[PDB]
Scaffold this active site. Sequence first.
Site, short mmCIF file in Angstrom:
data_model
loop_
_atom_site.label_atom_id
_atom_site.label_comp_id
_atom_site.label_asym_id
_atom_site.label_seq_id
_atom_site.Cartn_x
_atom_site.Cartn_y
_atom_site.Cartn_z
N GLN A 143 -11.86 -28.53 -122.58
CA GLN A 143 -12.39 -29.91 -122.62
C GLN A 143 -13.42 -30.25 -121.56
O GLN A 143 -13.98 -31.38 -121.58
CB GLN A 143 -11.27 -30.90 -122.39
N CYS A 156 -8.35 -33.65 -126.44
CA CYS A 156 -7.60 -32.56 -127.11
C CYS A 156 -7.84 -32.57 -128.61
O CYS A 156 -7.88 -31.51 -129.23
CB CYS A 156 -6.10 -32.63 -126.85
N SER A 174 -7.32 -39.87 -128.80
CA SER A 174 -7.64 -40.29 -130.18
C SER A 174 -6.33 -40.42 -130.95
O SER A 174 -5.31 -39.79 -130.58
CB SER A 174 -8.60 -39.29 -130.85
N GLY A 191 1.52 -37.47 -125.63
CA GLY A 191 1.14 -36.88 -126.93
C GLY A 191 -0.05 -35.93 -126.80
O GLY A 191 -0.96 -36.16 -125.99
N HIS A 192 -0.06 -34.86 -127.61
CA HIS A 192 -1.11 -33.84 -127.48
C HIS A 192 -1.37 -33.26 -128.86
O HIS A 192 -0.45 -33.23 -129.73
CB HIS A 192 -0.66 -32.75 -126.49
N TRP A 201 -3.31 -24.30 -127.40
CA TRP A 201 -3.12 -25.65 -126.86
C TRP A 201 -4.44 -26.37 -126.53
O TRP A 201 -4.44 -27.57 -126.20
CB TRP A 201 -2.25 -25.59 -125.59
C1 LIG Z 1 -5.50 -35.15 -125.82
C2 LIG Z 1 -5.50 -34.36 -124.52
O1 LIG Z 1 -6.61 -34.16 -123.97
O2 LIG Z 1 -4.40 -33.92 -124.06
C3 LIG Z 1 -4.50 -36.29 -125.78
O3 LIG Z 1 -3.20 -35.74 -125.63
C4 LIG Z 1 -4.50 -37.20 -127.00
O4 LIG Z 1 -5.52 -37.45 -127.65
N1 LIG Z 1 -3.30 -37.70 -127.29
C5 LIG Z 1 -3.07 -38.65 -128.39
C6 LIG Z 1 -1.69 -38.30 -128.92
C7 LIG Z 1 -1.71 -37.59 -130.26
C8 LIG Z 1 -0.40 -36.84 -130.50
C9 LIG Z 1 -2.94 -36.71 -130.47
C10 LIG Z 1 -2.95 -40.02 -127.80
O5 LIG Z 1 -2.34 -40.17 -126.74
N2 LIG Z 1 -3.53 -41.04 -128.43
C11 LIG Z 1 -3.49 -42.43 -127.96
C12 LIG Z 1 -4.31 -43.22 -128.98
C13 LIG Z 1 -5.77 -43.44 -128.58
C14 LIG Z 1 -5.99 -43.96 -127.15
N3 LIG Z 1 -6.45 -45.36 -127.16
C15 LIG Z 1 -7.38 -46.02 -127.87
N4 LIG Z 1 -7.58 -47.32 -127.64
N5 LIG Z 1 -8.13 -45.43 -128.81
#
Ligand SMILES: *[C@H](C(=O)O)[C@H](O)C(=O)N[C@@H](CC(C)C)C(=O)NCCCCNC(N)=[NH2+]
Length: 249
Positions: free
Chosen positions: A17, A47, A137, A194-195, A212
């Site tokens: 990243q 991620c 995201s 979350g990832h 990962w």
């Molecule tokens: C990615 C990383 O670099 O580790 C990161 O974990 C991630 O994108 N996590 C997501 C969880 C999902 C299981 C992919 C996450 O935490 N999303 C939160 C939603 C978006 C954040 N806020 C706004 N306003 N868009």
Amino acid sequence: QPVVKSLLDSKGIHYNQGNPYNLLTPVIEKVKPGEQSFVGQHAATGCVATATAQIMKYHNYPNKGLKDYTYTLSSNNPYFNHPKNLFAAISTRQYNWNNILPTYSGRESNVQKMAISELMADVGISVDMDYGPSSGSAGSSRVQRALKENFGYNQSVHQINRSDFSKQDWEAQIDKELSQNQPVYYQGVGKVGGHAFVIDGADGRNFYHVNWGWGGVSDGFFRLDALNPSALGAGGFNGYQSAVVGIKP
Ligand SMILES: *[C@H](C(=O)O)[C@H](O)C(=O)N[C@@H](CC(C)C)C(=O)NCCCCNC(N)=[NH2+]
């Protein structure tokens, strides 16, 4: 369960990243109170973009993007002045997959570093990335849309949610992708956060190979109910699981 050696490893694909992946993400403008400091540094690719970009590289697809994307960063994002409007000219992109290398270690040409950073920024924007020092995201729901609408992947691309399937039907769907040489976008949540990541192999013993998106750290085989990479030191990504399957041109 079939035996499928890591599809990403087979093509030498190992993204992360930071540099040079993040060379075209927005440059952080502000300080979040109590966090000193990231000003003037590029935001992380996120991620979700890293996982998605690795899968795209596996396919070397598309040669030409389909549709542009634009969105506005959340007014609650502390790192940028508001409004912050982002735009990816995906419909005009001629992605040169010869220049988008499977990994980067430092001696790559400017052309090659531009190629990967452009892909990472395009993908990030297409999934409404909440850019920051780390970048988040919604994941699967955004990924499936972006792959089809913006990148022109097959209509077969779709999100699957873990609680919508029995254990056997879930594993059957993942296995079928892997037997078709189709890496799977996957995500989950725990204690630790979350990832998103890529499932790209299987050992025939009900473990799945995971990339990962940390450049190789913790990559290896895991059970789907124990997605617990060593980097957690810390409950793994075992809740609220979803995947995007059917990923092919
Ligand atoms: C990615 C990383 O670099 O580790 C990161 O974990 C991630 O994108 N996590 C997501 C969880 C999902 C299981 C992919 C996450 O935490 N999303 C939160 C939603 C978006 C954040 N806020 C706004 N306003 N868009």
